Design a protein around this ligand. Structure first.
Ligand code: SAH
Lengths: 265, 265
């Protein structure tokens, strides 16, 4: 009579922790959602095969409006698992689902998995130096989101790095590329003119973290804006002031222009 | 010819990912370090038994000073693994180790695992709202470090949460407790008087993240400073102003006083 929130990790079915797998294998019912992120290296069947169970996939509406009608009822007489990409409680509104479980008299446990939030460490940028995070959302109709531009500004101002999650329209199979994010940001700079994001801004692109060969690229917007970083998902990072070793890693591992080695302390 | 940076995850031997375990099992040599952090819910013996390989433990000096003489030589003609608690490359100086590998003509791949940077999402605090992170260090002799106090100040000022890592002396196996961290901060506040950390400050304590039964507590310093949060490791967080949903989580899941619903929102 329990509910397990189990993260599946970054790229494929093997990114789940051993703990998550052994527990998932023994659950009576297994649900999952794949709209909060993209696991570009696996498939549902591959996942079902590994866990050895049938997985009922839920839409954003099933979860947000009917979690307590579809999932919680079964958790009262059985052990239920709710699988999600990355870590189940990161950059999502899933934490509130634990409140729903509590109110329905269901105990819940959380099994973590690798998250893009810590995976950014592979960019060479010190993780403690990351400031507030944000999401670049697709404009819709006459609505053009821009708050993420202010986040970058506020962080950069403090010498902190900015992690930018990119938009996703799962039902439309749409995954915002770093290129599209850069285009949108230049447009916002054009509007606000704060000098926050321009053709000369240094950025870092991390694509398909979790795979053995992710694409890690660093450089000026003017040079990367049209570069092909491979299939999604992508995340964009706008570094703040760099430490010598961060610059060195970006140049040696991410192919950044050797000129960034010369930091303006 | 290949070096694998493999994370062991948060708490015990089952926190490594399926991908990480399988890769580690195919490596000719396996190294590990436990000075950046320790796996409090397991032992080297249990990790060794699970991986089915003997594990050579390296000290901080072994890694920082001689990584290229101890680990890289073997990586030239064998598959080598380097295990670390949490997610690889999160520890500040680890990213640079990949540069050493490149310089030695050794290929390196990163296998991610759960990190406290993302696991703190279990506190119900929105991940995007976290600002710069810091480590609370013990004062020693004539040295009284307080930069972590300024980090909290700058974050809270902008409505951001502050993740605080607590001092650890791996070799001596001694952990700074959340209780001690609070005492130090109150002491730092008495000196700087910036109105950053007082008896009325709301804090969150996370202990044994990764275990199936972690300790998650939220409340004011005056009530938690002498509370028993259990065995280490402990993580201290000083939230900025809360979203009502964050406050509700803290009350319903972390036993926070209902008072935060009006005071810290
Ligand atoms: N493997 C990966 N590589 C690059 N970006 C990724 C990624 N996985 C997730 N993301 C980024 O994060 C967004 C989803 S946000 C949800 C994050 C998830 N709970 C976690 O713990 O990672 C995506 O739209 C994308 O921009």
């Amino acid at each position: 009579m329990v509910l397990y929130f189990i993260g599946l990790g970054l790229y494929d079915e093997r990114d789940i922790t051993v703990k998550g797998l052994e527990i998932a294998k023994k659950c009576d019912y297994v649900f999952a959602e794949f709209y909060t992120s993209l696991m570009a290296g696996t498939t549902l069947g591959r996942i079902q095969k590994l866990i050895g169970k049938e997985i009922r996939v839920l839409s954003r509406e099933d979860v947000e409006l009917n979690f307590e009608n579809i999932v919680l009822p079964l958790a009262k007489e059985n052990d239920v698992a709710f699988l999600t990409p990355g870590d189940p409680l990161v950059a999502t509104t899933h934490a509130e689902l634990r409140i729903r479980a509590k109110r329905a008299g269901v105990e819940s446990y959380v099994i973590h998995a690798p998250s893009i939030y810590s995976a950014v460490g592979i960019t060479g940028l010190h993780i403690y130096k990351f400031g507030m995070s944000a999401t670049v959302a697709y404009p819709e109709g006459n609505w053009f989101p821009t708050s993420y531009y202010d986040v970058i500004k506020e962080n950069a101002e403090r010498g902190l790095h900015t992690l930018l999650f990119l938009d996703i329209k799962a039902e439309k199979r749409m995954y915002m590329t770093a290129n599209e994010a850069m285009e949108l940001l230049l447009k916002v700079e054009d509007m606000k003119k704060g000098g926050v994001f321009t053709d000369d801004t240094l950025v870092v692109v991390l694509a398909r973290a979790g795979s053995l060969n992710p694409t890690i690229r660093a450089g000026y917007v003017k040079d990367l804006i049209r570069e092909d970083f491979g299939d999604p998902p992508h995340i964009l990072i706008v570094p703040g002031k760099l430490h010598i070793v961060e610059a060195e890693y970006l140049v040696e591992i991410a192919g950044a222009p050797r000129e960034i080695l010369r930091v303006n302390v």
